[PDB]
Amino acid sequence: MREIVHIQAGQCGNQIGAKFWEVISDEHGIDPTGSYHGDSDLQLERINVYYNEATGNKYVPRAILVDLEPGTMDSVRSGPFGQIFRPDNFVFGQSGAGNNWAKGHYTEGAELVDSVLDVVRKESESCDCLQGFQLTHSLGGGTGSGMGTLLISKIREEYPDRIMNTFSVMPSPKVSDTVVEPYNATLSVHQLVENTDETYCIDNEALYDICFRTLKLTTPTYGDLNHLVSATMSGVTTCLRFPGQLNADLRKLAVNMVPFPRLHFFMPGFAPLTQYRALTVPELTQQMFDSKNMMAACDPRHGRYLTVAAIFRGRMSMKEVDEQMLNVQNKNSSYFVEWIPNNVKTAVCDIPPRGLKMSATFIGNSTAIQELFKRISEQFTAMFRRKAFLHWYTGEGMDEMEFTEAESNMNDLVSEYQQYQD
């Protein structure tokens, strides 16, 4: 359990994946040219987890960039760290997916998938001991949603004994591109229930609310939302990238956070929300667990936590961290399940993210996540009961029955979370 292979598909997938590499390259002291100019050695001890080393002491990320149109991947190759990526790992087409799950999954996407698998196989074959894969994408479009899930299905067929992890962005009418987004998201969730071990649910509705109400941004942009997404992504990989007592990896994560195979959709949280006055430990814990700090638009007070994991970064008191975590558990013990003893894990890392003197990141497996699937389910049924906009999909070879199935499995998932909440 050492090397991770990263993959990013579609517009959203390649934009948050780009900011992710820009952030962690900075934390490990890797410049845009792949050279190391850091001061400590903690940034080089586990660097092979995400970076390959080339002759000449250069560090090249182990990432693969995928898209059915070249618009977004051109901007990445021209960005701040565009020169850092291996040139061969750019795989893209020209037709695009038109925000249509069927095009990404069945027609346009099928032509390109084999080329992606060739690059994945090339990276995997060079791994001393491959952990698994992580994928970034949105569920409301065509490429990341439709083709992204097709890739997951194929990768599981060749590497069935490796972990599959995703960062999945949920659509919201408050930040919408097309009216068919509920269709695409319902079809992708069905796939995710079957073929991933861990999924971080990044809700665009929650990101918007945080920028508007807390950060006081009247007209938020995708750039603003991705600032929150990159902070969250850096926080939830800290324990994978730095040497610590934990020594975490993707399998131990899944083993300890997922009590039932289907219920592997996690709710992430971060604090503080982005000035020179560092926060006290009690401030971190309080903010980290507040609804205003959740990245999925669900109220944790409407459900219970199956498992929780939290990391603290900076130079702080471990005693004070323990004293504050045990405090929140024992003062909100009504929102934790009783039948999983010691289901809250805490860890500390001495390296704080750039700019902050200390921060805290939260991973939650809560039954309140059902409010998200309910939201998407109601939007789905309002259109489907009149067969509205279906011709876009029946023209790609799909039948109505396939929609009835994804909707049916989506509602089963909602009732499954309600089962374990009572």
Binding site: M1, D128, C129, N247, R251, K252, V255, N256, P259, F260, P261, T307, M318, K319, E338, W339, I340, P341, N342, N343, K345, Y420
Partner: protein, 437 residues
């Protein structure tokens, strides 16, 4: 002269293994290069310390040990540690992919692929013995390797060395020093599979070692190094008789004869004192009576429980340092009147005592202060069943919903093994209640 072989499995087993062998070399005057200037029989001998060390023609004293782990991070510390020159590469065994805190993954999936390699490395040590006693096995309950692979190794050792004794040193799981939510599952599965193959096992609860390091050593956040150097002191006093001249517990079979009347109830409770902080430039040196009295204080034992509400079956007192029998008997007579020490009516109400004149050894610059006398008590009491009930209840909470069970099934295990191992733990709990009334 009869040899003993030690086996260290998983992270906990290997790290604790390093601590012990570091202390051994200090107590026997063996430098980190294997040289022993006090030994005058170069290349051989049948001395007491040769039960744990063999000798080469150049004068090196090599431990009779083997280190095993399904991943290599922890054993690489040994190969580059202060005592690297002590071991031979064939004695250290490492895999690629650990058991992911999964018993089934360590016993079935990955255990089958490496069991023969380890048995062949063990066979190489046995061949160099003329009169092998048995094995000492270190491991954890909670880890996927320490629980799953250990139980496979103990099954095979019984087959290849049917007449040899096997002792365990096991680390019982605690949330204060936690690593996985399924540690109750792995604890029950391995206790069920190892039981018929272990002659005597010493449990150490990480909650107890954690509280002692905080209370007595004034250490706010204890580390593995702190925990192990205190655990090494306990181990060194339990194995001192095998390495030094003496008459009490001079071979592995004596441990069963003096501590284990019933085969299944083979978990003696250990208690140690005094643990004094080395940060105190001076501390009153406790007497024989005082340190003996502390062996019946719950805050000093390796497994938190109330011996006042159980019955004893056997008791052994092991002293090290400036101790003479006269004082030991005075303290014993004193403790029988102050406290409640009730044996079972079918066992004698006595104590077996051993005294080693060499006082305890401490790591230079470590956390433990040098003392002039110390004692470790080994008592087989029913009160230790409290720890079985605590652990069995946590297993029942998760299993009622079948939570996490799919990770084990996916490795080839059947749900039936869960209830099978659980019913065995219910029978074990019942056997303690019959003895304790």
């Amino acid at each position: 002269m009869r040899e003993c072989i030690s086996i260290h499995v998983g992270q906990a087993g290997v790290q604790i293994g390093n601590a012990c062998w570091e202390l051994y070399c200090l107590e026997h005057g063996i430098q980190p290069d294997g040289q022993m200037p006090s030994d005058k029989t170069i290349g051989g001998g049948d001395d007491s310390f040769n039960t744990f060390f063999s000798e080469t023609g150049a004068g090196k004293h090599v431990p009779r040990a083997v280190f095993v782990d399904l991943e290599p991070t922890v054993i690489d510390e040994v190969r580059t540690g202060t005592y690297r020159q002590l071991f031979h590469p064939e004695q250290l065994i490492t895999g690629k992919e650990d058991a992911a805190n999964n018993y089934a993954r360590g016993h079935y999936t990955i255990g089958k692929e490496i069991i023969d390699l380890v048995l062949d490395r063990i066979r190489k040590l046995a061949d160099q013995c003329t009169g092998l006693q048995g094995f000492l096995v270190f491991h954890s309950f909670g880890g996927g390797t320490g629980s799953g692979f250990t139980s496979l190794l103990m099954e095979r050792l019984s087959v290849d060395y049917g007449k040899k004794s096997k002792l365990e040193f096991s680390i019982y799981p605690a949330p204060q020093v936690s690593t996985a939510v399924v540690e109750p599952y792995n604890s029950i599965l391995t206790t069920h599979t190892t039981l018929e193959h272990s002659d005597c096992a010493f449990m150490v609860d990480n909650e107890a070692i954690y509280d002692i390091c905080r209370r007595n050593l004034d250490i706010e956040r204890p580390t593995y190094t702190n925990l192990n150097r205190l655990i090494s002191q306990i181990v060194s006093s339990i194995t001192a008789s095998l390495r030094f001249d003496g008459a009490l517990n001079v071979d592995l079979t004596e441990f069963q004869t003096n501590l284990v009347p019933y085969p299944r109830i083979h978990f003696p409770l250990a208690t140690y004192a005094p643990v004094i902080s080395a940060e105190k430039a001076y501390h009153e040196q406790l007497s024989v009576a005082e340190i003996t009295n502390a062996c019946f204080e719950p805050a000093n034992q390796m497994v938190k429980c109330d011996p006042r509400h159980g019955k004893y079956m056997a008791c052994c007192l092991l002293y090290r340092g400036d101790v003479v029998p006269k004082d030991v008997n005075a303290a014993i007579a004193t403790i029988k009147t102050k406290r409640s020490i009730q044996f079972v009516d079918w066992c004698p109400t006595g104590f077996k005592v051993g005294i080693n004149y060499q006082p305890p050894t401490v790591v230079p610059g470590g956390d433990l202060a040098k003392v002039q006398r110390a004692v470790c008590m080994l008592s087989n009491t029913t009160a230790i069943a409290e720890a079985w009930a605590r652990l069995d209840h946590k297993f029942d909470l998760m299993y009622a919903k079948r939570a996490f069970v799919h990770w084990y099934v996916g490795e080839g295990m059947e749900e039936g093994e869960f209830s099978e191992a659980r019913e065995d733990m219910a029978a074990l709990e019942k056997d303690y209640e019959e003895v304790g009334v």
